[PDB]
Design a binder for this molecule. Sequence first.
Ligand SMILES: NC(=O)C1=CN([C@@H]2O[C@H](COP(=O)(O)OP(=O)(O)OC[C@H]3O[C@@H](n4cnc5c(N)ncnc54)[C@H](OP(=O)(O)O)[C@@H]3O)[C@@H](O)[C@H]2O)C=CC1
Ligand code: SF4
Ligand code: SF4
Ligand code: SF4
Ligand code: SF4
Ligand code: SF4
Ligand SMILES: [Zn+2]
Ligand SMILES: [Zn+2]
Lengths: 193, 56, 162, 252, 118, 198, 63, 90, 86, 338, 287
Amino acid sequence: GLWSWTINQMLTPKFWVHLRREGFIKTWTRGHKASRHAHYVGGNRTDGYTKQVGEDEFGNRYYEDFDVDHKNQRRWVEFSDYFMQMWSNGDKVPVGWHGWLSHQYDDFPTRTGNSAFVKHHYLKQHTANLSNTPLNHVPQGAPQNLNRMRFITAQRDRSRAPWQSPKGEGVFQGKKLIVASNSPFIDDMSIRD
Amino acid sequence: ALDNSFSPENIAQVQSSIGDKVTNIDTKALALNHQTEEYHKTSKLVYPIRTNLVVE
Amino acid sequence: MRVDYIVTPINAVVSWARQGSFWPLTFGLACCAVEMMHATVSRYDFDRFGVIFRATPRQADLILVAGTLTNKMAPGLRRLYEQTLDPKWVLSMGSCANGGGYYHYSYSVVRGCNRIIPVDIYVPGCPPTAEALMFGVLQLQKSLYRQINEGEKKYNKKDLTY
Amino acid sequence: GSEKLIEDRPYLQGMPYFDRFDYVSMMVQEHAYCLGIESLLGTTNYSATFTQIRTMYDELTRILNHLLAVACHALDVGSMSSVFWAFEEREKLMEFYERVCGARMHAAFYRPNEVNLNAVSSFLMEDILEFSRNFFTTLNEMHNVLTYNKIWKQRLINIGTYSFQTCLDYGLTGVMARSCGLKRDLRLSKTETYANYYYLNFRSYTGQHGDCYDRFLIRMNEMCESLNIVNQSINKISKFNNIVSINTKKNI
Amino acid sequence: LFRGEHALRRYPTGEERCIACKLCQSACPARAITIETEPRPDGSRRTVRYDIDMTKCIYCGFCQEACPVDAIVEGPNYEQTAYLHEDLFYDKYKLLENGDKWEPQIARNIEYLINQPL
Amino acid sequence: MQNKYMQPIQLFIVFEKLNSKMWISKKLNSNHSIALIPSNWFYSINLFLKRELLFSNITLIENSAIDTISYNLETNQNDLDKTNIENYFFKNKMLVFYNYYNYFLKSKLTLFIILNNLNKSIDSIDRIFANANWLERETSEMYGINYKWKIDTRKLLLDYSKIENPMLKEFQSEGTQDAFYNIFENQVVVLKNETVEL
Amino acid sequence: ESPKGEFGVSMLSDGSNKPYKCKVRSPALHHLQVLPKIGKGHFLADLVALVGTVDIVFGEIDR
Amino acid sequence: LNPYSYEALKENHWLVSDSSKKNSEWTHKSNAEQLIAKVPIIYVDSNIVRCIGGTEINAGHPQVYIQLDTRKHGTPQTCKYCGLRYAKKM
Amino acid sequence: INFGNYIRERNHYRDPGLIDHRIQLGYELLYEAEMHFSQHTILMQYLSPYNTPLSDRGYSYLEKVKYGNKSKFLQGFYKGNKPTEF
Amino acid sequence: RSTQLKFYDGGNRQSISGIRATIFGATGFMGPYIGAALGYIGSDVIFPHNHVYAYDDYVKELKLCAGSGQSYIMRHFNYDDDNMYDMAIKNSNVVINLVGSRLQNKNFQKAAYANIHVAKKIAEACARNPNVRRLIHFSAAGADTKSPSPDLHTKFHGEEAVLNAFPNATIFRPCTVYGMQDYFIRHWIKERDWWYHFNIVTDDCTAKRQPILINDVAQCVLNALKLQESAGQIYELGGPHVYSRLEVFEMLANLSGRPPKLAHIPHDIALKITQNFYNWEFFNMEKVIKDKLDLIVTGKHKTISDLYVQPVSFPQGAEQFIDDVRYRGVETHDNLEK
Amino acid sequence: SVYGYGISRYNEYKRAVEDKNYGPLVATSMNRCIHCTRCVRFATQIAGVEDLGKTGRGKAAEIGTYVEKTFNTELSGNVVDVCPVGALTNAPYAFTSRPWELKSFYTSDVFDTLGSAIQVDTRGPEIMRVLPRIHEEINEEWISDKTRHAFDGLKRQRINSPMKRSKDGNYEDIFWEEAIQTISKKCLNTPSDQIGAIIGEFADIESITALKDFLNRLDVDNFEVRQHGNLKVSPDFRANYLMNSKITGVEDADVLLLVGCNPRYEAPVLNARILKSTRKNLKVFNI
Ligand SMILES: NC(=O)C1=CN([C@@H]2O[C@H](COP(=O)(O)OP(=O)(O)OC[C@H]3O[C@@H](n4cnc5c(N)ncnc54)[C@H](OP(=O)(O)O)[C@@H]3O)[C@@H](O)[C@H]2O)C=CC1
Ligand code: SF4
Ligand code: SF4
Ligand code: SF4
Ligand code: SF4
Ligand code: SF4
Ligand SMILES: [Zn+2]
Ligand SMILES: [Zn+2]
């Protein structure tokens, strides 16, 4: 990952401003967090670098630059996890930032203040694709489910519930076998008066 | 959870019950909006169109 | 124990290479084929991730089922899968390939390409956008990179695998 | 077995099957199905006609289909790069689909008697005009590597030549029928026209040799005329004149 | 308007919007939706089963148009690639958590779409 | 209506031994004429059409068949008269329709043939119109039509090593077999199918 | 007038909510049918070019 | 009280009740019953109340009208689309 | 002999046009078999024995020993016609 | 305990047989065939494995033994934790163990681990779970407590351990199994193709073999499941006839037309070289040791006839697997068309 | 859909009606009522009960009982089928199904000795509801509540496999072969005079024919072991034990005499027929 900032891209006022303000580790790694173009690191311009439109609950940074050579490269995100080339995929962008980054709308989430997005009490946090991990989606009757029998038995019992046969030693009156009734309803006409 | 046809007290009570900190509502503010049809809130995109830069 | 000292590093070099040049087979059925060809052109460049299409299965590394599979085509698909050089991976793209799809109740359609050949990954849409196809291909690339060393071996007291 | 399935569903459930018939040109299939249903109902879709959406999107999918056909034919002949351009310029039309129905290929947009009026906005037509202006340039770019190329001419001229007799025996219609020399366009037919086509002004092209070169040239000219038709429709749904001040003739 | 991954929504109070009317089941051209309903002990009619075979679905949006309470929607997510065929058998838990995760964006989009006729 | 129209009446003028039954409808194009033709004159009629002046400039547009053994009106059962063409869909085992376009007269012509024999036999016209080869092959394989004097009788769209007519009403859309891979044989086989139902 | 030729639907309804018969007339089928007539006597490259010239899509042909 | 008793069934639309409301996370695969039970009763001044389940039409459920003039004064009623409960004020 | 058994099972036919249609189909399937159009595991369904095991593998005679002299009805009664879990 | 197992075998891939099965050691040769035999009638099959290369076809194709929702592949199996064994067979009423020492392996400790330790763990987990009805353990025909081969010694010890832990387990001892991907015919073909001139033999080829086709072992497993009297019995499975190794070489030569050539290397040199050098599939101590031992049905236990299976003859059953390697000599002109 | 204008212009508050409780068989949603009087006329003229009516005036009038009273009666559920709207609904059949996802079969009921013609609606392997049919010689148009609703007793307490009982009373599931072999050994060992049978309430002609033929082959001619409760009627002639005047005979007769008969519980539809006939000069006497 050598030359995240090329020599021609260095000596630019943008690079020195970024290094003076942000530091070295943050400045150098900006070429690793996003790998769009050599001349695009920190923004297309040269006088200064693009201000981030926002940040993320996972640390990702979101920028929008209006001086890109093609219209489709206006908005981009730099990820907090950049361990390898071909490591950060597109499922790490949260909900509101997803719509902002896909140009569905021009609103973006904000940590504090007047928000354009609802914040209900039952909302869950965005999760990446969990396939090929121990936390994938398992149908209730699939063999991977350890409690698959409770779902199978209920589906069977919806239309055919087997009669529970007497087990073990029982009480006999001649040949009839005596057990207590299994009705949860009350025979009120035998207790009423 | 409720439209303007309900009293501000009922709307505030329901919103407090469902734990709604965002979009605060006051009985003075809800009274003016009570029984009133209004368009959606709007914003403005002000020209010139440019990039926001950081320098110095 | 001592062999691992050479095997464990070299493994990465073996994976990286096959992650850097992942050549799929030029084979497209129906209209997920059109969507895939969109995913190949300059807007979404697979050649960025070292993905280029080879026409013969002997030079292919990934089989990409991208359309409806009929009962007339199943033996051909089985032969094409068998005639690819190992190691190989299979990507199932679109509803007609993942399951029956919009023709699941038909008399001449295979109810999913995984009844004929094993499938490594499934892409759900109809058609899955080039965005989603690129996402699935990148996921498969990362998985096959990590697939050579998933911690199957145990570590002894010297922190050495088997 | 799509026809059996269509026979096994209600009318609206079979319509997306037409999207999968000729999946390069999608809304024309829906238009044909909806026209059949409307004829069986004895009515017409006035909301679609007075908004010009059906004609406009028919011409847009015409451009899509001819772009794909020309690019793939050039790729088969040996011209490798031209396929990259038509696919970029047919990505914008896919975006235009996505902005009215939320899908890039299988729209399921046309309905027998319903038009989603809210799906069509004025900001969409301006982007369509921008696309047309740049499509002129992209079509010229494809033009100057193929049309006058000696290799292209020696590969396509006097290849697959046929006359009107074969063109009738084998039921050839469309671009092939216009190449064999026959003047057959359903849009311009008095008794067979549909969806605003009879009251526009566009040209249609016929060849005089009946070979591959004629078909290629006809497809390029049809793309240009589709641009012209789209412009005419947008003009028909446009408000040009304004109110001027009584004095000084100044616009208000 | 983009048609992506399906989700089941809730009212702002947390109540399910779906009332088990089975209009979405009959609207499906692919027959991908299966619904079973029982009266919930408090009396409201809710589904005991609501599942969608995502390998049968054609992502057409006929079901979200048919829903009269905007319960079932197609979200903006398209990165739903799975490694197993069984990961694409969506049950009520999966759709409910998809709705609970993607609710802000879906709400914003639906808000704009609703305001369009107005 | 609002256009010049004329019936194709010369066809029954030349063929003097045939009854004439023609329809025009507003559900069709204003230049579309539908006629009823007996099965034992179809080849001669097509021979006349292919060569006679003001008919020679004709093309075959479409061919198919209708299984009318299960045709029932579902609504408005009391709004049927003796002149309705659908009145000929009752008690008739099979129907076959051909659609042509004439460039000189600028007309659409549909011809209907009633097949009432159990073997469903009718002469082919693929020796007159080159269109009819694939069209008639598909119709024959879909509906079990037995075409006589045909250029090619092989299956067109159906799978190898199978005999079936899936477009008959008796046929269920799921078929009777499914294709699976067999580990014990290392190749694909066909088995009796069990299918999900909604 | 579809971009590939005259595309038609011939459909008969019995009065219910489902079509009794729906037949699809596709021009790509006719173009593929005529292809052998104009391709005989040509080279393999000419055959590939001819397949390109006939704008045939097999979803419409096979359906 | 026994949920299978005559009184409990009669005052529960002849259904076996669940006071804990925790049977529905398995039978109905969600905790919506608990959440809707967490919402108190809304007291309305008039005899009839209109519910749409939201602030605007098409954001909620179709317009429904609930009677609050009951045989027993002040008996709360439940919307059949959303679980909100209303009663006449005093 | 197996294909002759097939033809014998088609002996009751008495409509000549139907027989001509069947002969056309038979010629077509034979041509498909002789030109590698079909798969061997698919075309073997017309050459397979009706009541005899195939010669390339072993066979089980368990149900022959247990249901020795029992009639066909008893054999079909002991072995059900539907799954028993549901 | 109850050994009863009622299931419906008259169904197909999408039916419900009533069998829920767990198969151990299915990443070898038997695995796919046993799994297909169980899952082709509508059973649920679980495949625990810990395979070095997860992308190998030995793992992926295990998904084909049953349909979607019926076959499951459990990865990263510990083979050392009791909890994982309990999780594997929690809802299984049938358990099959195909784990065994691999041919490349020459270490006695690893052989005991494969043949004794894993089998003991499986049997102990089966005993704890009260819903397990039948357990089928796979052993070797020539298994013996004094065998010079560590594989056979450890397999006899594993038989003892399994029968001790789960006294209702069924032991299968195949003689030698051939098929498309086997170590008998495929190894012969590949060794002749590599050593273009000969097949290497390290003995007089007088050892006896009783080959049995893979398709018959699956039928034997199904028949044993159908038979309730086989619960605590040992069965030796072999073909109809007994051949010496020389006779097998000659028969393979005659069936394909390749002229035989058996180059002889003395036994002690081969033993020393395989002992002191690295071992892989085509060069190992196990081949050298086993080539002097008879792997046949000894008659001490029950045979394949007690499972009501009629195995196919070796010449008839092995012919289709050498069709591609047939000798191309002088043929008629009509043989040019294929 | 077929006859209306197709769109509305009413833009005011609608009336709201509080729901009533009629019992566990009929569910009420009285906002849907159109005041069609079908339920009142059915209760008065068919069921014979006088609990329903219309109280109030104008738009605020309400259909139903004045006081809180259940709609307890046989043939109660029939009123649901009479009401054209969802005002009265089948309470057991609440929210479970939709009309388009059901397959229907024609059959006859066995819950009462009148073979009521019924229609069974199912979805997959689950029977969903039972509806009446038209016969005009049996049940006219109507079925009793037991016929309509007691079918859900087939979904539970089912015997699904052969079983054997030990001496201590433990039940074990066995195979068909073992059970049949055990019974066959018992049949071969037991003397003829020690063999008996009991014929059940729900026994069809084929089953009784099979059992009779088998026991006759075993030289057994006794088909009862119970000491009391046997019918003292000879099977020599069909007229001995049958309804010789048929179900419609109540319309033909002018004097009916019941002897130990309670038609209200044993045949509610026949009771409704007798009520209709008594409205037309039929006299009923009871012993
Ligand atoms: N096939 C034959 O000719 C005969 C075979 N047998 C026996 O039948 C059984 C099945 O046969 P087959 O499939 O051909 O044999 P294989 O050698 O091909 O397969 C052995 C299986 O056991 C697993 N295994 C091996 N060592 C270990 C270990 N230490 N820990 C965990 N798992 C292990 C392997 O998995 P992995 O290595 O991937 O971890 C593989 O799944 C074996 O026990 C074999 O000895 C008996 C007679 C004849
Ligand atoms: S899943 Fe759908 S869009 Fe994809 S190839 Fe199939 S029919 Fe076309
Ligand atoms: S369409 Fe909507 S309200 Fe109806 S059953 Fe489906 S999710 Fe529920
Ligand atoms: S999007 Fe269409 S195909 Fe998919 S579940 Fe909804 S209705 Fe069915
Ligand atoms: S049947 Fe219904 S609408 Fe008619 S009077 Fe009764 S409750 Fe009212
Ligand atoms: S289904 Fe009928 S009774 Fe029910 S509300 Fe709608 S129109 Fe009225
Ligand atoms: Zn409400
Ligand atoms: Zn020992």
